[PDB]
Amino acid sequence: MRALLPYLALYKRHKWMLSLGIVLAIVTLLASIGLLTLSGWFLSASAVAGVAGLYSFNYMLPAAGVRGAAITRTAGRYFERLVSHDATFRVLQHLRIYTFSKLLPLSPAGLARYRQGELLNRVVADVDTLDHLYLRVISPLVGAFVVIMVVTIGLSFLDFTLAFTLGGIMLLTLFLMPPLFYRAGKSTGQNLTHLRGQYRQQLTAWLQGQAELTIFGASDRYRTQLENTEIQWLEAQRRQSELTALSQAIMLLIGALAVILMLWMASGGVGGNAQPGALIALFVFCALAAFEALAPVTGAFQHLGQVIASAVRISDLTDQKPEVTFPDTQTRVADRVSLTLRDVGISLQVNAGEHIAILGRTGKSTLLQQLTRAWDPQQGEILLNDSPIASLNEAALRQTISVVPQRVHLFSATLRDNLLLASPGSSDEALSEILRRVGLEKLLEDAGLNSWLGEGGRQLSGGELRRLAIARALLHDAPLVLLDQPTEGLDATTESQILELLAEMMREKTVLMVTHRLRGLSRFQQIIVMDNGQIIEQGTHAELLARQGRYYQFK
Amino acid sequence: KSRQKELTRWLKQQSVISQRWLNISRLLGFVSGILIIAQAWFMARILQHMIMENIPREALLLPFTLLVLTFVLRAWVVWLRERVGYHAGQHIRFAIRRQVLDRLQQAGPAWIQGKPAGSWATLVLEQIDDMHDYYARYLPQMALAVSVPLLIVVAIFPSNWAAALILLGTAPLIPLFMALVGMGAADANRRNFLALARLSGHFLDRLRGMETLRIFGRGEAEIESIRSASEDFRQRTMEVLRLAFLSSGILEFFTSLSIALVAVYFGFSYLGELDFGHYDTGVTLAAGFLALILAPEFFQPLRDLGTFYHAKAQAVGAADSLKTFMETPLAHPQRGEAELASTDPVTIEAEELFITSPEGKTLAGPLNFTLPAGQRAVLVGRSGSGKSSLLNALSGFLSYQGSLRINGIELRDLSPESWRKHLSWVGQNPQLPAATLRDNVLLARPDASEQELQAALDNAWVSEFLPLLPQGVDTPVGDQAARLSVGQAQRVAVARALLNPCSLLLLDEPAASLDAHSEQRVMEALNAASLRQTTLMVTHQLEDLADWDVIWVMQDGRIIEQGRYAELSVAGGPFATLLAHRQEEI
Ligand SMILES: Nc1ncnc2c1ncn2[C@@H]1O[C@H](COP(=O)(O)OP(=O)(O)NP(=O)(O)O)[C@@H](O)[C@H]1O
Ligand SMILES: [Mg+2]
């Protein structure tokens, strides 16, 4: 319950739209009650007055009341649905901005241990569930409470022992029944998520291992084991529905006990007078209508457990500590940087124009993670342009380094916004000039700069994504460029183009390249071979090839 | 669209298993409308006695007793009806999940591999369980929504026909206006369908690519993209909801108009302002309470049906991907009844195979080869050249139109149950489905002594790292072999291959995706285990193939060269060029 505190504080941004959506939920739900209890009294007063009372009974005030209560119940529900859903989409926006601003400082490192794809599908699902806290928990529970307190206060102007009996019954089942059924269904609700995720692990094992099981003859012995988990899983779901059946049967008997008591207790007398003619039906029709307030109240408290669970997963994930801290020194962006590296325990110095190639023996490269400050090194110091790497703020670090990832991410946006990612300020022609130079010709056809890429649009190929990563790295020009196996799983007819693109496009830059492929290393100054995080030999292609060494065997 | 007509007919066809449960729930929804009428009749009669005739409560103990009794029967047929409805939807999911798993086990590994194992779990878990509320809640409510309202009208008509026309007069009006509104709600849901589908996966896209936003300095400028794409999502889906909350508000308007009109008509007819509606027998108070208690109950069935109408959509979406799956025309490899009793290394001769996927596409073209008993062979080639498709065809997982005669008997005439008794094999990925690491190894022989059990362990060099595990031999094999490494998960696959005598041994790529050390360990075990019987291997490690009897290089599913390794290594053929390819990479 204290888990929801960071997210309930997010509600203060839209406190008037969130409260108005509840105020309308009460006005609607009091007009439902008030329309049926005013009708029930009007029929009783009219019947008692009879034909003789046609001129002494003021029937225009109740008639104008049932018309008002019918209009505000009809239109109160419409605006309650609009205001409560508009405010739910403004909480969702504020939840996503809040949880994206917190997952950025811990982007590569904090989320490393979690396998992604399922972690992020859990993050999107948890943020959505934290959005249901208002419509599905707060609005029904708070609305039910103050509707009971208004019909209990309102009815107390007629009789106290009757208003506190209908109010007592209604308010006792608002506070006791929802928790007592969460406790009863707590055991079978976790015996449900155990037997479901157990069936899922026995199913993918039976499906993935279908070749191994079929040939070793165990595909049927493991099918009945899978079918015995479903049999146990379908008994846990049956036990859960046998508690929802009891919840609804009991709620029908509590609303029955309120009607019976009002029929019996209000027959003796409402207030002072015995034989109260039309006041019996004002109480028995309030008891009949007022249990619509408590209709959504047990599923509101039940769903609250899921919100608290999601409020912990999001909170424990976004309250981690960022591995690296960037100091806001406001250092100006450097130019023609000369990366020097010592005891990181490799040591290697890259001058301000050298095209280093690193031949690691056959995931994401660890040396490039430290250069982009994914995490600080434990052993040595990294210096960009005779200044420590940690001395540069985030804004300047992202501007003196232009890395191509091994995993090129194709954002769902247009082709223009996949290139404006690198340089926001570039004009539209610049994107067209560089999409040609790189060889990305098929993209520019049929108005491609507005074409949708990524999910929901056209997918690029492996050799065509690699040209997009280099397109960003060239638009976001920086003195230091960190290639990460740019030619990997790539066609030989285009691998030469990528390498030739690297040599001519990024000639006046401090290119550092990490690969395991030997093609086109003759144009790379100071080739470095690296094994188990250790530098064996260094030197130009000619120098490293003449002397016997690790480069020679491979060549 | 005829898609919904075909899907909703499929859903109705899958409900025959639970026809008994859907007939009881239809019968219990008709009793519930009888008790609603009875409960409103006793309440109206007690109230009339106390208000009009001024009868004390202690003289009405019989109508109170009968009223308490209907209130208890109503709660009983609601508890009963909630549990009958569950059995309706359970027996349908249990009988469809059995059909999905039967079609998925018969289709074999050839078709299962097409989609990720998490794509199949969505179909078998998420999609099948999405059809529960359609049968448990929506279908029972769709019948209660037409019975109970007609019972209400039939019960009020003898008492008063003007009160029975207020409720009935809105029966044609309610769907006439929802359909009139609904056709305006399909306009806004059509010109926003695409823009709202690109904005839904926008958060996950910006969240799956935070590494690219980090390394370009765009993390802060993709918060103004979340703010803009969430504002646009709201202002575009609130447009749709302004037309979908009107449709729900048509029923609330006619619910409110009917209760107001019942009150005003009865209230005015008691004072003489109105003189129609009754049968000239005088309008009583119990006739106005009966119509007023039952006025909100007329529309309740329709209002509950409006909260279940989503359960028809997610059960048509689920029935969509469950009907395409169940009607794929995929054809299975035919199973003979002959039995191979040689119990010794078998000879594989093959000509004009044309091995085909279950979908009917041809995977390996014209294949012509022979394999004498006990002679190891190796398949080499490029990625996507149909090297593995021959191994699957020899296992029986794929269909071939040609001649694949093993030991003189064609494969398609050989019973699969007995053929796989002489077959052991090691795939690129060691799928371990058993419980414990010892149960993975004992999967081949469910009952064997520890002497040969240990013999098959150390021979595969799995005993090397047993003390490293927390429990040793009986270490609990984690799901997807998470506890083990990929290197250790491979040597345990080798252990069960060696444990059972095999008349043919098929290695897919046992050394691929291995670490430094285990790569020799798996080869040392297998290279010595490939001699005891006929063997066929597939590999990309071309360095040490100087020992294997024949080299079968293939491209686009056609064996090109043959012969010992030395012959085609320097002959300048495809193999020599393919061997030079490995020299480009370190
Ligand atoms: N069940 C299947 N359904 C459809 N296509 C398939 C199926 N099995 C294989 N293919 C395709 O048919 C071709 C045969 O490739 P494959 O049988 O995997 O040979 P391969 O050499 O083992 N590939 P690789 O493992 O990368 O070396 C490829 O293009 C596959 O994608
Ligand atoms: Mg293969």
Swiss-Prot record, chain A:
Query: By what means is the activity of this protein regulated?
Result: ATPase activity is stimulated by various thiol compounds. The presence of heme leads to a further enhancement of thiol-stimulated ATPase activity, although a large excess of heme inhibits activity. Glutathione transport is inhibited by sodium orthovanadate, an inhibitor of ABC-type transport systems, but not by the proton ionophore carbonyl cyanide m-chlorophenylhydrazone (CCCP).
Q: What is this protein called?
A: Glutathione/L-cysteine transport system ATP-binding/permease protein CydC
Assembly notes: Forms a heterodimer with CydD.
Q: Which organism is it from?
A: Escherichia coli (strain K12)
Which family does the UniProt entry place this protein in? Answer: Belongs to the ABC transporter superfamily. Cysteine exporter (TC 3.A.1.129.1) family.
Q: What UniProt keywords are attached to this protein's entry?
A: Amino-acid transport, ATP-binding, Cell inner membrane, Cell membrane, Membrane, Nucleotide-binding, Translocase, Transmembrane, Transmembrane helix, Transport
Which residues are on the Cytoplasmic side of the membrane?
Answer: 1-15, 58-136, 183-249, 298-555
The superkingdom of the source organism is Bacteria
Q: Which InterPro entries match?
A: AAA+_ATPase (IPR003593), ABC1_TM_dom (IPR011527), ABC1_TM_sf (IPR036640), ABC_CydC/D (IPR014223), ABC_transporter-like_ATP-bd (IPR003439), ABC_transporter-like_CS (IPR017871), P-loop_NTPase (IPR027417), Type_1_exporter (IPR039421)
ABC transmembrane type-1 domain boundaries: 20-306
Swiss-Prot record, chain B:
| Top-level class of the enzyme under EC nomenclature | translocase
Where exactly are the transmembrane stretches of this chain? 14-34, 35-55, 135-155, 160-180, 248-268, 275-295
ABC transmembrane type-1 domain segment(s): 18-304
The induction text for this entry reads: Part of the cydDC operon, which is highly expressed under aerobic growth conditions and during anaerobic growth with alternative electron acceptors such as nitrite or nitrate. Induction by nitrate and nitrite is dependent on NarL and Fnr.
> From its record, what is one biological process in GO terms?
heme transmembrane transport
| Disruption phenotype annotation | Mutation affects cysteine transport. Inactivation of the gene leads to H(2)O(2) sensitivity and to growth inhibition in the presence of cysteine. Mutant lacks functional cytochrome bd complex. It is also defective in the assembly of periplasmic c-type cytochromes. Mutant is much more sensitive to the lethal effects of heat than the wild-type strain. Displays a cysteine-reversible defect in motility and sensitivity to benzylpenicillin and dithiothreitol. Mutant is hypersensitive to high cysteine concentrations and accumulates higher cytoplasmic cysteine levels.
Q: What is the effect of changing R242H?
A: Does not affect cytochrome d levels
Binding of ATP: at which residues? L371, P372, A373, G374, Q375, R376, A377, V378
Q: Which intervals hold domain ABC transporter?
A: 337-570
Q: Spell out which residues lie on the membrane's Cytoplasmic side.
A: 1-13, 56-134, 181-247, 296-571
Name of the protein in question: Glutathione/L-cysteine transport system ATP-binding/permease protein CydD
Highest classification ranks of the organism? Bacteria, Pseudomonadati, Pseudomonadota, Gammaproteobacteria, Enterobacterales
What's the name of its gene?
Answer: cydD
